[PDB]
């Protein structure tokens, strides 16, 4: 699994469940093309977005819909979404774990590359 | 000054100086329109981006060029840039401070609204 | 002002006001000695803790009472308090800003040394 | 496994390997008693610190020796260590994951409680 996302809720001390995820890849024309999407599981994780074969060199954007997550909890948050944009596999295939820690007015994102 | 930005370097324990920034407004069209830009000062800050008359309700994107900043220091960073996307509402508070804390493989961003 | 503290609330997007703080110095003995204390201001800040003459090289601990702060808001927090332990060296820079970003189940702390 | 620690390096985008960990429990006399210790694995994790039976109600402190970690990489960091102090199991047994994200002048800590 070359691309995995983990999302945590810092208000509740728990995984962030059912958070929607959309991944885009920058295309030849320099526009964002849809690449994969999904929802986090009860452990706050999303896997199975892609395969090594399809996950070629390129610039990827992971958009996490944090706004809907907080609104469903009764909270009106600051950000519309959290975005993570990065170049992948430009020196050969790698495995990427993207983690996000959410609070209503702040978020942190971390990448582990192996 | 309704919108201020502050950027800190968690590797050297200092303000992040000379970091380029671009601010966009979501165009009725849903296209991003250039709105303001600048480079952070010796104190890691950028203000005077807009005025209260021009800063109307809407969706705004703040794009911080973190990749050029790490490259200047000789460090290979993970992210292409850091983006902060938010709604400005006249309803709530009037002053927005966007802060960003940078590491090569992680960033944290926080909003103070007062 | 060689030592300043700043505390922010990531849940409400505001300074953390009236938060108690205690500063300790490691005693030749390795016992913590009271050194200074105060409550954060309406801007989430605490300064005037010490003077340059009294702030000599040593190991210092800053203890922030985050549990009382969340309890005041009606939120059950995870941590008993947040602690920041560091060496002050005259060698390097002279001014220390300790910042803390609080959530009920997470905190982040950063030092700017200038 | 009721108590697990995960440590990540935000400079290198990797688990933090071989980081020393000490856990203490506050004793009747209100002093810190040694409870368990260990080093993180190649995945940046530490498990097997304790059992449900031994992990009774109480106030625990997890001390992570971040200073030795950064010094071994050639970096002189700000903090002496990272400390996480919390009450555990006061409403029945729970499972605790303590995560820490490290940079030389900043760290973040998060708890997931299940």
UniProtKB/Swiss-Prot annotation, chains A, B, C, D:
Changing residue 64 to V: In AMYLD1; amyloid polyneuropathy. Changing residue 68 to Y: In AMYLD1; amyloid polyneuropathy. L-thyroxine binds at residues 6, 45, 108. Changing residue 107 to S: In AMYLD1; amyloid polyneuropathy. Changing residue 36 to D: In AMYLD1; amyloid cardiomyopathy. Changing residue 55 to L: In AMYLD1; amyloid polyneuropathy. The keyword Secreted applies. Changing residue 107 to V: Requires 2 nucleotide substitutions. Keywords: Amyloid, Amyloidosis, Cytoplasm, Disease variant, Gamma-carboxyglutamic acid, Glycoprotein, Hormone, Neuropathy, Phosphoprotein, Secreted, Signal, Sulfation, Thyroid hormone, Transport. Changing residue 105 to H: In CTS1; amyloid deposit on carpal tunnel; patients show no other abnormalities. Changing residue 78 to M: Loss of tetramerization. Changing residue 85 to A: In a patient with amyloidosis. Changing residue 75 to S: In AMYLD1; amyloid polyneuropathy; almost no RBP binding. It is found in: Secreted; Cytoplasm. The modification 4-carboxyglutamate is found at residue 33. Changing residue 46 to P: In AMYLD1; amyloid polyneuropathy. Changing residue 101 to M: Loss of tetramerization. Changing residue 49 to H: In AMYLD1; amyloid polyneuropathy. The keyword RNA-binding does not apply. One of its GO terms (molecular function) is hormone binding. The modification Phosphoserine is found at residue 43. Not glycosylated under normal conditions. Following unfolding, caused for example by variant AMYLD1 'Gly-38', the cryptic Asn-89 site is exposed and glycosylated by STT3B-containing OST complex, leading to its degradation by the ER-associated degradation (ERAD) pathway. Sulfonation of the reactive cysteine Cys-1 enhances the stability of the native conformation of TTR, avoiding misassembly of the protein leading to amyloid formation. Belongs to the transthyretin family. This is Transthyretin. It comes from Homo sapiens. The chain holds residues 30 to 143 of 147 of the full protein.
